Design a protein around this ligand. Structure first.
Ligand code: MG
Ligand code: ZN
Length: 220
């Protein structure tokens, strides 16, 4: 029930929240350098899939970005077998974020989105329970309303990612863009996306606890 949660703060008009899933990884440092070049803050929904880059979580926070939870294991067949397994994994990821940044996470992004149906193969009904359990735990969750197309099993070109994000943003006064910073071709699109947005009156912001969240329909 939306009635039970605090109002969010209107962020203004022509807003873009660039967000990045599945990292950190080998391309994250380069992405941080690009964001610094344009003085833009973003949001990272992190995993422990590539623990050789775990210190990038500390760097993301140090540089002013929002560090949020995606999943420690990012294994659907583990985290979606029970509420208990999901939160064991979520807590492991939060603990790494605390170790690295000094702070707990406040925001999460469910693997597959809150709208995913892959979780039906492991626990029917679990997403309906988890959106309520995450809320009861004082956590916020965010899906997205602009696809970059960078999740396709066959990669698209950097130029196609640029065009996908620029065209999707124009559909929304307030956009939450999904990219994955573990994909080199998609990271390499971010510079042109920022150039275009800044030249067209858009403001890039990081997600915070007072931001409006983007929520999909829950399908499981
Ligand atoms: Mg329960
Ligand atoms: Zn993911």
């Amino acid at each position: 029930d939306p009635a039970a949660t605090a109002d969010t703060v209107n962020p203004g008009n022509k807003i873009i929240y660039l967000t990045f899933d599945d990292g950190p990884g080998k391309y994250t440092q380069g992405l941080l350098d690009v964001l610094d070049k344009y003085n833009v803050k973003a949001t990272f929904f992190v995993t422990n899939t590539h623990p050789d880059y775990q210190n990038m979580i500390a760097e993301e926070a140090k540089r002013g970005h929002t560090v949020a939870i995606h999943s420690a294991s990012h294994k659907y067949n583990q985290i979606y077998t029970s509420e208990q397994a999901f939160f064991d994994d979520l807590e492991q990821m939060n603990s790494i974020i605390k170790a690295q940044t000094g702070n707990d996470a406040s925001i999460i992004r469910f693997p597959g989105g809150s709208s995913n149906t892959v979780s039906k193969d492991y626990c029917p009904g679990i997403m309906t329970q988890l959106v309520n359990d995450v809320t009861a735990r004082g956590l916020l969750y965010c899906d997205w309303n602009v696809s970059s197309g960078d999740a396709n099993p066959k990669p698209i070109s950097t130029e196609q990612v640029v065009q996908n994000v620029i065209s999707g943003v124009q559909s929304h006064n307030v956009s939450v863009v999904l990219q994955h910073d573990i994909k080199e071709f998609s990271v390499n699109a971010v510079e042109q996306i920022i150039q275009w947005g800044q030249a067209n009156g858009y403001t890039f912001l990081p997600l915070t606890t007072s931001s409006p969240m983007s929520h999909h329909r829950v399908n499981n």
